[PDB]
UniProtKB/Swiss-Prot annotation, chains A, B:
It comes from Alcaligenes xylosoxydans xylosoxydans. The keyword Heme applies. This is Cytochrome c'. Binds 1 heme c group covalently per subunit. InterPro entries: Cyt_c/b562, Cyt_c_II, Cyt_c_prime, Cyt_c_prime_subgr.
């Protein structure tokens, strides 16, 4: 869907911006600093679920650029494992939110965050 | 969810970037220049539906900036009418996509696009 590689870079950076917001805005909830409203979190995690599927299609062939490492493309199966595993952790977060289980939400949230960082460590330029 | 107004501006601009992509990538389909696969479009419109609900919460009080006109805040009910009407046109696009009806998709797409432009004309800085 991208006329030029720059359009794919802009897309995936904007998807990442929205994922950071929808994930990070839950930090105070998981820490107990903000109240836990199960319906509010359920809805927010449903938005995060949608968004967390979106970046990967914007690392298509010829879309090199931004702060994306070339090893994303040369190790295609390894980068795929990482994004699929990240979305597996999103599924776990969804299950916790849908159940209304806060303890499970805490745990799942931590696992999601670790998966974000693991990918950036390997595949995002400093 | 925004620590500073700049964070709200960044969010709503990124949401708009993703909506432009998910809406605009259908132009060749509606024009017949690309093939119509009902399931593909159904899925894409479900992403657009999610995204098209997101900007409005990021024009919260104190989030003035970017290319957003102050009349967004001083005429709160009028700006609300416009975003609600835009999401009504999104619902119509969803119904067309879910039905697998291309002619209906064409028409709905045009109506959505007109609603984007009507809001920008009144509420986005040149
Ligand atoms: C690989 C499988 C990743 C996972 C999982 C996550 N991110 Fe990511 N992120 C990745 C790359 C390769 C890039 C660089 C994109 C580019 O072309 O520049 C990014 C970038 C971000 C950014 C910065 C966006 C920008 O302003 O330019 C943010 C804020 C970000 N990523 C956040 C983020 C979060 C919150 C994640 C888990 C919920 C997450 N990322 C996962 C690769 C990958
Ligand atoms: C008001 C109810 C709007 C509707 C409906 C749509 N848009 Fe919008 N858009 C609006 C404003 C007030 C702004 C400025 C935001 C800011 O603070 O700068 C925008 C911005 C955009 C942009 C530019 C984003 C950027 O790169 O900075 C784009 C690409 C955009 N809008 C696209 C877009 C599309 C495709 C829409 C219909 C599907 C749409 N907008 C509707 C206000 C409103």
């Amino acid at each position: 869907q991208f006329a030029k590689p720059e359009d794919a870079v802009k897309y995936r950076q904007s998807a990442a911006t929205l994922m950071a917001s929808h994930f990070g805005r839950m930090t105070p909830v998981v820490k107990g600093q903000a109240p836990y409203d199960a319906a509010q979190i359920k809805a927010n995690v449903e938005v995060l679920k949608t968004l967390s599927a979106l970046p990967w299609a914007a690392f298509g062939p010829g879309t090199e650029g931004g702060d994306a490492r070339p090893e994303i493309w040369s190790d295609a199966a390894s980068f795929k494992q990482k994004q699929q595993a990240f979305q597996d952790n999103i599924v776990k977060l969804s299950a916790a939110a849908d159940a209304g289980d806060l303890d499970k939400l805490r745990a799942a949230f931590g696992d999601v965050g670790a998966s974000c960082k693991a990918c950036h460590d390997a595949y995002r330029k400093k």
